[PDB]
C-alpha cells in the first residue's frame, strides 16, 4: 500500500477537490451557469445542472480527497439542504490558499490553526449578520418565503417555485413552531400541471386500490397494516400454504379464502371503514372489505403507511401479528380525489394537526422529482428557519462582511493563525467573486467595492447575482437564513482542515 506524503496527496487533493469545488461553483448562483451533465461510466442521458450536487452524485471522482466532498456535499444536501455546491467550493477556496501555504512552507497544522479560530470569527461576524427575522409569524411567513425559495435558486427549476414555495411556506406556516416533515406527506405524483402541485390538510395516499373499496368515508377507522391476505399470515382461520397430507394442499385455497375472509374479520373487526396495507391485499379480502364498508388499499406507500401511522395516529399491524389487536389510524375524512390527473386518497381528521400532504404534481417527473428535490432542502432550511427564525445577508454581503471582519481580525491576530486566517477570510472575499463571475460581472469591481462597502461594514449592499451587481440585503429574499451559513461555515473549512491533517495517504489501490 503506497504512502502518499505531503505534496503528492496534497496536490492530488487540490486538483480534484478544488476542481470539484469548481464545476460546482460553475453552478453556484442561479446565474451559476448550467453544467451539462456528462455521466461517468453509465447513463449517457444528460440532464443539465445549475446545482453542483448533481455532478457530485452523477459524476464519480477518483480523487479520494474529492471523494470526501461529495459526502460533505451530501451532508449539506441531506442534513442542511442548501449550501451544497457552496460547502464544496469554500473548502476549495481554502484549498487554493493551502496551495501556496504548503509550498509556501506553512505546515497544514498551522493551516488549520488559524482556521480553527477563524471559523468562528466568520461565524461570529455571521452571528453578527445573524439577526432574527421571523420573530413574527408574518415575518416568519416572509422569512420562510425569504429563504424557502432561496434554497431553490441555484437548483434548476426556480420557476414553478412561485407555486412551490407558497406551498412550501404554507405547510411550514401550518407547522406553527413545531417542525414536522413527516406530518407533511410528500407525494410526487404525475398528472395535472406543475403549478398544480398541491398541499392537502390531512394525510393522503397516491396509492388508490380503486373504487371497488369505499372511496369517501366519514369517521373512518384506518387499519395501518403490513397484514397480508394471499400472503397467509399467522392465526390459522383455515389452511394456509402447507402440505400436511395428500389433499392438504387443496384444503389451502377454500380455507385460505376463509383465512383471507377471516383476515377480513380480524382486520374488519377493528371496526374499520378503511384498511390501509403496506403489503398485499388479496382481491377477495379486498372486496370483502369493500363489502364491509372498509377501504382496503393494496401495498400502500411505505412512507405513506408510515406517515399515515405518524400523522393519522395509526399503528402498523405488526404484519397481522395484531390480527384484531393493532391500534387503528383514525382520520375522520376519506377522500378519493383527483389532484393532477390521478385520483388520490385523501385522509383528514388525522391525529396530527400539522398533518398535511404536500402533493407535488408532475406535468413531467423530471421537474416533479426536481420539485421534490427542491421541496425538502427548503423544508430542511425551513425547519431550521422555524427553530431559529433569522437571516444572514448573502450574495457576498456577510461574506465580505465576514471577509472584512476575519481579515481585520487576521490583521489583529496575525501570528501563525492569520497565515490561515488571512487565507481564511479571503475565501469569504473570494466566494463573492464566484457568484458575480457566474453572473458574468467583474468581481474586482464589485468585490473590492463590496470590500469597501463591508470595509465600511455592511448588512445591506451586497453582490446581487440577480442584478449581477452589488445591491441591498435588507431581507430582500436574497438575504440568506443564518441556518445554512453556520452549517456551511462549519462544514466547509472542515474538509479542508480534514485533508490538512491527513496529507499522509497509504494507498493499496
Amino acid at each position: 500500500a503506497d504512502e502518499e506524503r505531503a505534496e503528492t496527496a496534497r496536490l492530488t487533493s487540490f486538483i480534484g477537490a478544488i476542481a470539484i469545488g469548481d464545476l460546482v461553483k460553475s453552478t453556484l448562483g442561479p446565474k451559476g451557469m448550467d453544467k451539462i451533465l456528462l455521466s461517468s461510466g453509465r447513463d449517457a442521458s444528460l440532464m443539465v445542472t445549475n446545482d453542483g450536487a448533481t455532478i457530485l452524485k452523477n459524476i464519480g471522482v477518483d480523487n479520494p480527497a474529492a471523494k470526501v466532498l461529495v459526502d460533505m456535499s451530501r451532508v449539506q444536501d441531506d442534513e442542511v439542504g442548501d449550501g451544497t455546491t457552496s460547502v464544496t467550493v469554500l473548502a476549495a477556496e481554502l484549498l487554493r490558499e493551502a496551495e501556496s501555504l504548503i509550498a509556501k512552507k506553512i505546515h497544514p497544522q498551522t493551516i488549520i490553526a488559524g482556521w480553527r479560530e477563524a471559523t468562528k470569527a466568520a461565524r461570529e461576524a455571521l452571528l453578527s449578520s445573524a439577526v432574527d427575522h421571523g420573530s413574527d409569524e408574518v415575518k416568519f411567513r416572509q422569512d420562510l418565503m425569504n429563504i424557502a425559495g432561496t434554497t431553490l435558486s441555484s437548483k434548476l427549476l426556480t420557476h414553478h417555485k412561485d407555486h412551490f414555495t407558497k406551498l412550501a411556506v404554507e405547510a411550514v406556516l401550518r407547522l406553527k413552531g413545531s417542525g414536522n416533515l413527516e406530518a407533511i406527506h410528500i407525494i410526487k405524483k404525475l398528472g395535472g400541471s406543475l403549478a398544480d402541485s398541491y398541499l392537502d390538510e390531512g394525510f393522503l395516499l397516491d396509492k388508490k386500490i380503486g373504487v371497488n373499496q369505499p372511496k369517501r368515508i366519514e369517521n373512518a377507522k384506518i387499519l395501518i397494516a403490513n397484514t397480508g391476505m394471499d400472503t397467509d399470515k399467522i392465526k390459522i382461520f383455515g389452511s394456509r400454504v402447507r402440505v400436511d397430507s395428500t389433499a392438504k394442499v387443496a384444503e389451502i385455497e377454500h380455507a385460505e379464502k376463509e383465512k383471507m375472509k377471516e383476515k377480513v374479520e380480524r382486520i374488519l373487526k377493528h371496526g374499520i371503514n378503511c384498511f390501509i396495507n403496506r403489503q398485499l391485499i388479496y382481491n377477495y379480502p379486498e372486496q370483502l372489505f369493500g363489502a364491509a364498508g372498509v377501504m382496503a388499499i393494496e401495498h400502500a406507500d411505505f412512507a405513506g403507511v408510515e406517515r399515515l401511522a405518524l400523522v393519522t395516529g395509526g399503528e402498523i399491524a405488526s404484519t397481522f401479528d395484531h390480527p384484531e389487536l393493532v391500534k387503528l389510524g383514525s382520520c375522520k375524512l376519506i377522500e378519493e380525489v383527483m389532484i393532477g390527473e390521478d385520483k388520490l386518497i385523501h385522509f383528514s381528521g388525522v391525529a396530527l394537526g400539522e398533518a398535511c400532504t404536500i402533493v407535488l404534481r408532475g406535468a413531467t417527473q423530471q421537474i416533479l422529482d426536481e420539485a421534490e428535490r427542491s421541496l425538502h432542502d427548503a423544508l430542511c432550511v425551513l425547519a431550521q428557519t422555524v427553530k431559529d427564525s433569522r437571516t444572514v445577508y448573502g450574495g457576498g454581503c456577510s461574506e465580505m462582511l465576514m471577509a472584512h471582519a476575519v481579515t481585520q481580525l487576521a490583521n489583529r491576530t496575525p501570528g501563525k493563525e492569520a497565515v490561515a486566517m488571512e487565507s481564511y477570510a479571503k475565501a469569504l472575499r473570494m466566494l463573492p467573486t464566484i457568484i458575480a463571475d457566474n453572473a458574468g460581472y467583474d468581481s474586482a469591481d464589485l468585490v473590492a467595492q463590496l470590500r469597501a462597502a463591508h470595509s465600511e461594514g455592511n448588512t445591506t449592499a451586497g453582490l446581487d447575482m440577480r442584478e449581477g451587481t452589488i445591491g441591498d440585503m435588507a431581507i430582500l429574499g436574497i438575504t440568506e437564513s443564518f441556518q445554512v451559513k453556520r452549517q456551511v461555515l462549519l462544514s466547509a473549512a472542515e474538509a479542508a482542515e480534514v485533508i490538512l491533517r491527513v496529507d499522509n495517504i497509504i494507498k493499496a489501490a
Partner: protein, 508 residues
C-alpha cells in the same frame, strides 16, 4: 475552467451548426435532398429537418440538441421541421462571438431569450388574424399552406376532410390548438380515397365476431382486457386431463369461466366488446367467444390497443382489465357500432356516433392501394397540422421567411435602441433571422446575398409585400404566390432555437 466548458460549448456551438447545416441547404423543397449513409451504412435521401437529424446521428451533445429541435417543433406543430433547425445555427453565429466579444453567455442567453420576447413580439404584430371558427379560413390557410407546399392531390380532397374533422373538433373561436387528439387518423385496407370518412364514433381496425351481431345500436362498447379462456398453463382452456376419475372431478369447476365472463359481458350488458389480441391476451376461448358472439354482443376480438386507447379516452370506453373493473358503465356507449365490410374491401368495426370526451372524430385514411391510403394520411394530416398551428396562435402571417428578414431588420435597430451590453447581443440575435431565407434564397437558386439585402430594406419599405417567394427564392411576395405561415409554424421555431441555445449557451 469555463474554457474547457467553452471549448466543450464551442464544440457544442460548432457541432450544433455541423450536422444542422445539412438541414440548411435542405430548407424547403428548393432546399435539397441529402443522401445520408446511416449507422447501418445505407444511403438515405432526405430534404427534411425531422428526418435528417433523427436518421443518422452521433454522440455529441449538439446532436442530442439537434433531434430535440425538429421534435419540439413536431409536438408543437409537425410543420417546419427543417425551418426550426435553420434558426439554430443562425443564432449560433449570433451566439458564438458575444463570448469572444466579451459578453457573458447568460447575458448572451438572457439577451436572446428576452431578445426573443421583444423580438418575436412584432411577428404576431406583423401577422394577420384569420377566422378559426370559419371552415374556409381554416381550410384556406390550411390549403394555402398546402398550396405553398407539396401535398395537394388528395389534400384538396382531404384537406377539407381535415377541416371537416377540424370544423367538427373546433369548439372555441381560437380553436385552442386543435389538438389532433380530437381527430383520429385511421386506415382501411380495401377502398379508395373517396371512402375516407369522418365518424363521430370510432372506426376500429378489423373486427372478430363469429356468431355475433355485425351492426348494433346504442352500443355499449365492451372492453375485454380479461380472457374468455380460463387462465392458461399448457392450454387455452383450463382443461388438462391426466385422469378421468379426476376429469369428472375436473368437469365441475371448468364450466364457469367460459360461461360467466362471457355472460358477464351481457350481464352488465354489452352491445360491443373490445378485445385485445389472442397474442395480446393470454387465451380467448372461441367456444366461449362464439356463445359470447351469439349473445348478440358486438365482439371485436383481437383489437389493437392504441385504438382502444383512442376508444378509451376519446369516445369514453373506460378501462376494463378485470371483472372487478367490468361493468356496464366502464363500457363506452356507441350511438352506433357496426362491423363494416363497406368502403371497399375488408372488415372494420365502426362505432358510429358516441358519447365522447372532447370532440372525437375518426378520419379514416383510404386509397385504392396502401400508398394511396398513405397518400390519404398527410392528405388529412398535413392540413390538420397547419390548422393546429394556425389555431394555437390565432393570427396568420405572410410566410416565406420575409418575417425572418422583415423583423431581422427591425429588432437590430430596436436592439440598438436597448443600448446596454445586450444591444450588440440582441442585434446579433436579430440578424440571425436573415440567414434562414438566405439559405432559402440560396437553395431556391441564384442570389441570397442580394435577396435579404433589399428585403430587409424593403421591410423598412414595403415589408409584407417584398419577401422571399420560395419558388422564386428572391425579392418577391409571399402574398403574390401565397406562402402563409400559420403563426405557430413560425411561433414554434421561435423559442426552440433560443431555448436549447439558452440552455447550450448556459451549458458548461
Amino acid at each position: 475552467d469555463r474554457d474547457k466548458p467553452a471549448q466543450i460549448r464551442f464544440s457544442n456551438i460548432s457541432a450544433a451548426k455541423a450536422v444542422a447545416d445539412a438541414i440548411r441547404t435542405s430548407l424547403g423543397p428548393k432546399g435539397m435532398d441529402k443522401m445520408i449513409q446511416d449507422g447501418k451504412g445505407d444511403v438515405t435521401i432526405t430534404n427534411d429537418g425531422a428526418t435528417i437529424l433523427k436518421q443518422m446521428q452521433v454522440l455529441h451533445p449538439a446532436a442530442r440538441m439537434l433531434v430535440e429541435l425538429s421534435k419540439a417543433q413536431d409536438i408543437e406543430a409537425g410543420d417546419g421541421t427543417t425551418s426550426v433547425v435553420i434558426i439554430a445555427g443562425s443564432l449560433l453565429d449570433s451566439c458564438t462571438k458575444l463570448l469572444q466579444k466579451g459578453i457573458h453567455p447568460t447575458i448572451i442567453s438572457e439577451s436572446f431569450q428576452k431578445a426573443l420576447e421583444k423580438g418575436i413580439e412584432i411577428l404576431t404584430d406583423m401577422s394577420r388574424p384569420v377566422e378559426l371558427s370559419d371552415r374556409e379560413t381554416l381550410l384556406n390557410s390550411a390549403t394555402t399552406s398546402l398550396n405553398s407546399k407539396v401535398v395537394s392531390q388528395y389534400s384538396s380532397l382531404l384537406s377539407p376532410m381535415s377541416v371537416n374533422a377540424v370544423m367538427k373538433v373546433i369548439d372555441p373561436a381560437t380553436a385552442t390548438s386543435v389538438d389532433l387528439r380530437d381527430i383520429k387518423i385511421v386506415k382501411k385496407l380495401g377502398g379508395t380515397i373517396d371512402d375516407c370518412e369522418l365518424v363521430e364514433g370510432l372506426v376500429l381496425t378489423q373486427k372478430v365476431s363469429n356468431s355475433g351481431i355485425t351492426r348494433v345500436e346504442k352500443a355499449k362498447i365492451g372492453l375485454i382486457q380479461f380472457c374468455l379462456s380460463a387462465p392458461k398453463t399448457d392450454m387455452d382452456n383450463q382443461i388438462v386431463v391426466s385422469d378421468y376419475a379426476q376429469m369428472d372431478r375436473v368437469l365441475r369447476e371448468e364450466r364457469a369461466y367460459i360461461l360467466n365472463l362471457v355472460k358477464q359481458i351481457k350481464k352488465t350488458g354489452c352491445n360491443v366488446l373490445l378485445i385485445q389480441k389472442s397474442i395480446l391476451r393470454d387465451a380467448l376461448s372461441d367456444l366461449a367467444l362464439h356463445f359470447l358472439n351469439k349473445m348478440k354482443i358486438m365482439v371485436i376480438k383481437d383489437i389493437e390497443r392504441e385504438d382502444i386507447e383512442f376508444i378509451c379516452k376519446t369516445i369514453g370506453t373506460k378501462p376494463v382489465a378485470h371483472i372487478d373493473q367490468f361493468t356496464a358503465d366502464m363500457l363506452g356507449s356507441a350511438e352506433l357500432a357496426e362491423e363494416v365490410n363497406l368502403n371497399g374491401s375488408g372488415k372494420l368495426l365502426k362505432i358510429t356516433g358516441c358519447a365522447s370526451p372532447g370532440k372525437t372524430v375518426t378520419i379514416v385514411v383510404r386509397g385504392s392501394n396502401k400508398l394511396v391510403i398513405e397518400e390519404a394520411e398527410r392528405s388529412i394530416h398535413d392540413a390538420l397540422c397547419v390548422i393546429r398551428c394556425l389555431v394555437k396562435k390565432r393570427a396568420l402571417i405572410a410566410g416565406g421567411g420575409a418575417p425572418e428578414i422583415e423583423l431581422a431588420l427591425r429588432l437590430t435597430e430596436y436592439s440598438r435602441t436597448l443600448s446596454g451590453m445586450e444591444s450588440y447581443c440582441v442585434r446579433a440575435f436579430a440578424d440571425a433571422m436573415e440567414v434562414i431565407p438566405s439559405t432559402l434564397a440560396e437553395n431556391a437558386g441564384l442570389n441570397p446575398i442580394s435577396t435579404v439585402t433589399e428585403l430587409r430594406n424593403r421591410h423598412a419599405q414595403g415589408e409584407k409585400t417584398a419577401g422571399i417567394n420560395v419558388r422564386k427564392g428572391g425579392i418577391s411576395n409571399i402574398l403574390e404566390e401565397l406562402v402563409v405561415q400559420p403563426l405557430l409554424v413560425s411561433v414554434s421555431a421561435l423559442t426552440l432555437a433560443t431555448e436549447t441555445v439558452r440552455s447550450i449557451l448556459k451549458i458548461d
